[PDB]
């Protein structure tokens, strides 16, 4: 759905702790600000992408305490209130299956300087002016939106999308959804015990599947990994000479005078500015991959969750009955229920 926000101090990356280089970078001007406009456009719309998918309903519905949902067992996907973050059981698996290099978005000077300036990826990034910004919606607000959608679905069916949430007994709702797939509603009521058990057993296998197999969340890790790799490449590229006598900016200024340093510094500015142009270009292209995916997830939310899609294989294989959203790091997981 989204990817990590980033911002770059264009001067601090190119010309870290050098007034002489900073004065020479001025001779390029808008190029540094053009980079920041692009990254801001990327970052500002990562919040949009998350808003389009999750914030579809502007009313936080909450489940009743009496879970008499016709024998269907949503306890495995509804919020788990006693936990510090009011996420569901399955969502806590999803958040554990994706690992991120940093947590909490605050890394102070104290816990990062000296011995740990050498060691940490993020410390190397932050010192060279590369930063990762926090998303607008926290993982808790994302879960509240997911809770509202899931709680509204089970208690009101698709009515809560088309207007005000009109309650309806869940077996009555599932009877509507059988009519949607061309199976007469009496086929549900005459088999409700088996249908409820098969849903409960199917959701159980979802827990076991996500508990067991390591490669399930490839897409969401692939996004976190690519964003990390792009920044960690950007820092390594500070080691390149680009034809200058040295990669180290200061080893030039300490061995050459203003005019002989200007030649050598100009190469580093050109090369390091090109490195940011390359990184920003990759991120603009990449953000378009994520935007299309976030526009798909937004459509699957509207059409698989807030309704019942008659489209084939749009909400999984089989005849779509209903879908339940589950938040995941930088993404969304749809549990597509299908009659086969």
């Amino acid at each position: 759905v989204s990817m990590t926000k980033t911002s770059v101090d264009c001067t601090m990356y190119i010309c870290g702790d050098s007034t002489e280089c900073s004065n020479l970078l001025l001779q390029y001007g808008s190029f540094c600000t053009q980079l920041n406009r692009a990254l801001t456009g990327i970052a500002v719309e990562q919040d949009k992408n998350t808003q389009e998918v999750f914030a579809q309903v502007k009313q936080i519905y909450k489940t009743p305490p009496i879970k008499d949902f016709g024998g269907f067992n949503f306890s495995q996907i509804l919020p788990d209130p006693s936990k510090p973050s009011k996420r569901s059981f399955i969502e806590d698996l999803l958040f554990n299956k994706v690992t991120l290099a940093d947590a909490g978005f605050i890394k102070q000077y104290g816990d990062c300087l000296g011995d740990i300036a050498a060691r940490d990826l993020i410390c190397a990034q932050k010192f060279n002016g590369l930063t990762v910004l926090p998303p607008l919606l926290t993982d808790e607000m994302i879960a509240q939106y997911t809770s509202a959608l899931l709680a509204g679905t089970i208690t009101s069916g698709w009515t809560f999308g088309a207007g005000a949430a009109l309650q309806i007994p869940f077996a009555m709702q599932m009877a509507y959804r059988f009519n949607g797939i061309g199976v007469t509603q009496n086929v549900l009521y005459e088999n409700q015990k088996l249908i409820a058990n098969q849903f409960n057993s199917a959701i159980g296998k979802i827990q076991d599947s996500l508990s067991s197999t390591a490669s399930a969340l490839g897409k969401l890790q692939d996004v976190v990994n690519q964003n990390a790799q792009a920044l960690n490449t950007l820092v390594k590229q500070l080691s390149s000479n680009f034809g200058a006598i040295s990669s180290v900016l200061n080893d030039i200024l300490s061995r050459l005078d203003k005019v002989e340093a200007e030649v050598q510094i100009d190469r580093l500015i050109t090369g390091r500015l090109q490195s940011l142009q390359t990184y920003v270009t990759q991120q603009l292209i990449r953000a378009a991959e994520i935007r299309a995916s976030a526009n798909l997830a937004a459509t699957k939310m509207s059409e698989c969750v807030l309704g019942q899609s008659k489209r084939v294989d749009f909400c999984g294989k089989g005849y779509h009955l209903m879908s339940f959203p589950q938040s995941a790091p930088h993404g969304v997981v749809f549990l597509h229920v299908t009659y086969v």
């Binding site: 914030a55 309903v57 502007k58 009313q59 936080i60 519905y61 909450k62 489940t63 009743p64 008499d68 016709g70 607008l136 607000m141 509240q144 939106y145 509202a148 709680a151 509204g152 089970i154 208690t155 009101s156 809560f160 207007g163 949430a165 009109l166 309650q167 309806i168 007994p169 009555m172």
Partner: peptide
């Protein structure tokens, strides 16, 4: 801290339906 929206417990009952 931003508000997501109004909080609204639905009236769900095993034998209650609302019709416009």
């Amino acid at each position: 801290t931003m508000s997501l929206g109004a909080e609204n417990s639905v009236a769900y009952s095993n034998n209650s339906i609302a019709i416009p």
